[PDB]
């Protein structure tokens, strides 16, 4: 109970009724009270993280005489109308069932199975689990990075991908109301279950939380977005040491979802604060990095081969207007992704709000052959052909800044007509509209197909002399800046054709 070391058992229950849950910084419902210290140990007060008395269908997974290992799956428990819930062998156990509950209903402290070890100890296994929120739950492989966490957001997926396992970062208050793209990513990405650590702390970030998030929707089931999460609460009603491990309880509740095989994304929030009080500084960065460490796609522990995968999106938000000093320089030294959400953007109302200048994904290549394979083949070159303009568009924009717009070549405006219609009918995208709050992967590539297109022959028309005024004002621009509104892809798809014979339309009116 007591013991030396880094705490004597700082640990999480994991089994049923971890969905839907409001928690604290170490797994206690619904607001309890104080703990202090770490570094070494810590105290603790009254609440049972999951009921005893609540009773789950069991449906066994396994037979007497089946051999196990940790990881392996032993039964299912439906847990809401979303998520069946995986039963597992606690890791370091292994050994020959020689029991097993048959189908009915159980408590959680009832013993559903018994596992015979190789040198003869019975092991008592019962639907849930208790580990160490400081030691990362074990695993047979880290996967590199390879398979994009689909996220129906434009920029992101095509510009700054996140990977399944990867780890990202926003600037913070999640609560802001300048920006809907952090609630984009909870309920759309596609991981069966979120893990969200909103550490909104005072007013209206706080009771926005309590009775809005029990009527949100998962837009894929129609059902409550709960029925998929878990919340973990950071109020400043709370002590300064549950605050500091609720990531790492989250992290623990994130990676026992992995082990079942699920696609996970754990989202942290953070505030404007005064953290302050082993050689320093460093250390704490060290520390984070650690944490930063435990995302990852791996191969689970089990029999089975069997794959799931934790996403890491965390907030930031510097104690200032400046992005420099306590956690952004450090997170973003181990984050792999950076969407800078942009106060000057926002106020142009450019939505979502995305610097396509100051963000970048380390994973492009890494997810590539998932686009190429699977979607397109020319993904990765549009993308980087997008960017290339989107890049000369900036710098046009800085010389026009000093010299003006007069001496603009036709070349040169092109680029600007074309860049233009990119950020307006592609980046930009409406997170409050029935079909574009949402962009599949198919329709994602079928959107920069026609706009490139239409790039390539505004650039032959240029060369053939056809006025650019008169490219300006083809019918299909129009249609061009809709498309993002346009659920059927094959219409979509048939602009590009519709551009062409336009612009042929052009090219016989100039003899060109
Ligand atoms: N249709 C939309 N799609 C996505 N985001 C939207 C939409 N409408 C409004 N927003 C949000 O406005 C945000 C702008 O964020 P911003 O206020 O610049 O962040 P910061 O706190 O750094 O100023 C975008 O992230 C975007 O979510």
Same mark, same amino acid.
Do not use: C, W, Y
């Given at each position: 109970e007591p013991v030396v070391g880094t705490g004597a058992s700082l640990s999480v229950e994991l089994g049923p009724?971890?969905?839907?849950s409001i928690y604290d910084g170490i797994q206690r419902p619904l607001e309890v009270i104080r703990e202090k210290t770490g570094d070494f140990i810590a105290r603790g007060v009254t609440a049972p993280?999951?009921?005893?008395d609540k009773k789950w269908h069991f449906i066994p997974k396994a037979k007497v005489g089946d051999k196990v290992v940790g990881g392996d799956i032993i039964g299912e428990v439906?847990?809401?109308?979303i998520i069946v819930h995986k039963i597992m062998v606690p890791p370091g156990i292994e050994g020959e069932i020689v029991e097993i509950a048959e189908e009915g209903d159980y408590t959680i402290e009832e013993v559903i199975a018994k596992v015979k070890t190789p040198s003869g100890e019975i092991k008592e296994l019962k639907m849930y689990q208790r580990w160490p929120v400081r030691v990362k739950r074990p695993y047979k492989e880290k996967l590199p990075p390879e398979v994009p966490l689909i996220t129906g957001q434009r920029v992101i997926d095509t510009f700054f991908p996140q990977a399944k396992g990867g780890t990202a970062a926003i600037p913070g208050p999640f609560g802001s109301g300048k920006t809907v793209t952090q609630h984009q990513l909870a309920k759309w990405s596609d991981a069966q279950v979120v893990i969200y650590i909103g550490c909104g702390e005072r007013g209206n970030e706080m009771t926005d939380v309590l009775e809005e998030f029990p009527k949100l929707k998962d837009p894929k089931t129609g059902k409550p977005l709960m029925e998929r999460t878990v919340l973990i609460a950071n109020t400043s009603n709370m002590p300064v040491a549950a605050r500091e491990a609720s990531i790492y309880t989250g992290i623990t509740i994130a990676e026992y979802f992995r082990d079942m095989g699920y696609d996970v994304a754990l989202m942290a929030d953070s505030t404007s604060r005064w953290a302050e009080a082993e050689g320093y500084p460093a250390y704490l960065a060290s520390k984070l990095a650690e944490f930063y460490e435990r995302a990852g796609r791996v191969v689970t522990l089990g029999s089975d081969y069997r794959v799931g995968s934790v996403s890491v999106i965390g907030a930031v938000s510097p =104690?200032?207007?400046?992005?420099?000093?306590?956690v952004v320089q450090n997170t973003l030294r181990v984050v792999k992704v950076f969407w800078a959400l942009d106060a000057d953007l926002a106020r142009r109302r450019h939505?979502?709000?995305?610097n396509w200048l100051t963000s970048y994904s380390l994973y492009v290549d890494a997810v590539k052959d998932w686009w190429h394979k699977?979607?397109? =083949?020319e993904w990765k070159a549009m993308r980087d052909k997008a960017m290339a303009l989107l890049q000369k568009e900036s710098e046009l924009q800085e010389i026009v800044r000093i010299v003006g717009p007069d001496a603009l070549p036709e070349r040169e405006r092109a680029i600007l007509l074309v860049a233009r219609m990119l950020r307006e009918d592609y980046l930009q995208q409406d997170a409050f509209d029935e079909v574009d709050t949402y962009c599949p992967p198919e329709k994602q590539v079928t959107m920069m197909r026609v706009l490139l297109n239409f790039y390539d022959k505004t650039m032959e028309a240029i060369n053939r002399g056809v006025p650019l005024e008169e490219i300006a004002k083809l019918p299909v621009r129009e249609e061009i800046g809709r498309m993002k509104f346009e659920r059927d892809v094959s219409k979509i798809r048939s602009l590009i054709d519709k551009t062409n014979e336009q612009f042929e339309e052009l090219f016989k009116k100039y003899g060109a």
């Open positions: 009724r971890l969905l839907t993280a999951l009921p005893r439906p847990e809401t109308s =104690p200032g207007g400046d992005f420099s000093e306590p939505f979502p709000a995305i699977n979607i397109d =083949p």
